[PDB]
Design a protein around this ligand. Structure first.
Ligand SMILES: [Cl-]
Ligand SMILES: [Cl-]
Ligand SMILES: [Cl-]
Ligand code: NA
Ligand code: NA
Lengths: 16, 16, 16, 16, 16, 16, 16, 16, 16, 16, 16, 16
């Protein structure tokens, strides 16, 4: 899978 | 909201 | 085009 | 994270 | 299929 | 434009 | 609703 | 940045 | 395949 | 149009 | 919910 | 990368 990063603060990984 | 980063060069934030 | 980064490990660029 | 709602009936949350 | 709700005004359902 | 709702907590509108 | 256009050749509309 | 076009009527640009 | 048009400026095709 | 296949259960076509 | 399929190799299901 | 499948007929892969 891929992990996209985003600022939610703190940086989080979104798994796809 | 989430901020996703992308390269456009410069890095930009895309807000959701 | 924009390039989104993702972890796949190595960081890769996804072009849009 | 964000939670988007949808009707599946019951309403469910989709998490991002 | 899922139905997502949106304001278009009236609330509509978008089917997927 | 369409407005999608999401829970961010508070409910927000995302404009498209 | 929105209509997005695309080339399929003919130009088509995608309704949302 | 990208701008996607759609018919909303009038044409609107959706900015990314 | 579909080609979606966007302003990137110049108007470009995004192929799917 | 493209047809994407997803499990909805049965595997169904989603038309784009 | 929907399950979308992708080749990752193995075929994986992505839940929505 | 992930490969998503679609019917275009041929079955094609869309790379992400
Ligand atoms: Cl996943
Ligand atoms: Cl592209
Ligand atoms: Cl369609
Ligand atoms: Na917010
Ligand atoms: Na860059």
């Amino acid at each position: 899978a891929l992990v996209f990063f985003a600022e939610d603060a703190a940086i989080i990984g979104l798994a796809v």
